[PDB]
């Protein structure tokens, strides 16, 4: 926390997304709502989000950290679905920014104990790897389209292990 | 009530003889503490809500008596007896304006006298040894102690 994940991802949106022909998607998963509003207004100012015409180049999905775990565990899938559609039917390049994709895991962990599952190594659900794989495996560049996925991943207490 | 004459401090510190700095610094510090205290105290004593208060007491007569005694009775105020240092000011006028000024000005007068005397002298290419003896009494060769030629101690 406090190292530059959000600033770096905003910088990437500033560079790549602004000068990118294809569409773009931003799924804010379990992050501060202040930042969601700041991004909305910065995008409106830059022009990627146009409130007047139909020339907007970014679709936003928000599941911020005031939501109950059920919504945080699924807003990533909602953003991923929007990106998947733009990949397949539109048959075009897509960007997909997620911030953070650790809140998906964490939100999955906040309900596992109440669903009757014994916990795993460190208070995590037994299905951590499978639950994360069944999501990260739809964010891919198939032969029908191409998703460039940038993910911010919180590392609790700087512990990379 | 209060209007304190302003001060310059770097100026103030120029006027303390070395034998008197030990009291000057203490006076500075005491001024500092007192000024901080005065700033601490408020501009006015806060008011009193006599009506409400006497409305919230049983023996309204007793509180009325205290209120009236407060109104009639006032507080004293100190005097300038501790300001006897008034006297000192006049004494200073003597050194500053009468004594030190006067002898200082006379010493000036003499220093001028000497300066214009030393500035109006013939070009040295025209002068004579008697002239050096008189303008500079340092070039005189005392015969009272070296009567014989050269009147110098040759080891010189």
């Amino acid at each position: 926390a406090g190292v530059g994940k959000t600033v770096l991802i905003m910088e990437l949106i500033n560079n790549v997304a602004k000068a990118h022909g294809g569409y773009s998607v931003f799924a804010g998963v379990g992050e501060r709502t202040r930042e969601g509003n700041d991004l909305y207004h910065e995008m409106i100012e830059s022009g990627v989000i146009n409130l007047k015409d139909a020339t907007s180049k970014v679709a936003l999905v928000y599941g911020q950290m005031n939501e109950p775990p059920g919504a945080r565990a699924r807003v990533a899938l909602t953003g991923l679905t929007v990106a998947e559609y733009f990949r397949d039917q539109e048959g075009q390049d897509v960007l997909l920014f997620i911030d953070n994709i650790f809140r998906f895991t964490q939100a999955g962990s906040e309900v596992s104990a109440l669903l009757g599952r014994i916990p795993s190594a460190v208070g995590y659900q037994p299905t951590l790897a499978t639950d994360m794989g069944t999501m990260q495996e739809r964010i891919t560049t198939t032969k029908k389209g191409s998703i460039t996925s940038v993910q911010a991943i919180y590392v609790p207490a700087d512990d990379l292990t | 009530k209060l209007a304190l004459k302003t001060i310059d401090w770097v100026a103030f510190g120029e006027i303390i003889p070395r034998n008197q700095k030990a009291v000057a610094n203490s006076l500075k510090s005491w001024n500092e503490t007192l000024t901080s205290r005065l700033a601490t105290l408020p501009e006015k004593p806060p008011a009193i809500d006599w009506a409400y208060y006497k409305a919230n007491v049983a023996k309204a007569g007793l509180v009325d008596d205290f209120e009236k005694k407060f109104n009639a009775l006032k507080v004293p105020i100190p005097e300038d007896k501790y300001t006897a240092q008034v006297d000192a000011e006049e004494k200073e006028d003597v050194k500053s304006c009468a004594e030190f000024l006067t002898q200082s000005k006379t010493r000036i007068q003499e220093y001028e006298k000497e300066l214009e005397k030393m500035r109006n002298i013939i070009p040295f290419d025209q002068m004579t040894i008697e002239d050096l003896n008189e303008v500079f009494p340092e070039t005189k060769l005392d015969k009272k102690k070296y009567p014989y030629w050269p009147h110098r101690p040759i080891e010189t």
């Binding site: - | 005065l38 004593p45 105020i77 100190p78 000011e89 500053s96």
Partner: protein, 54 residues
């Protein structure tokens, strides 16, 4: 000559030490007076607060 001129210049402003002393004495008396005022005020309010608390 210049040394004497500077000394004379300082003579003019010699009076600041007395000025400081006067300011100090006056404002010290003022401080004591204000302390007396506030002390009577505080004691009387505590005095009467006794009765209301009772």
């Amino acid at each position: 000559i210049d040394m004497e001129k500077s000394q004379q210049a300082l003579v003019q402003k010699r009076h600041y030490l007395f000025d400081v002393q006067r300011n100090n004495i006056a404002m010290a008396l003022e401080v004591t007076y204000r302390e007396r005022l506030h002390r009577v005020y505080r004691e009387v309010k505590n005095r009467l607060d006794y009765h209301i608390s009772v």
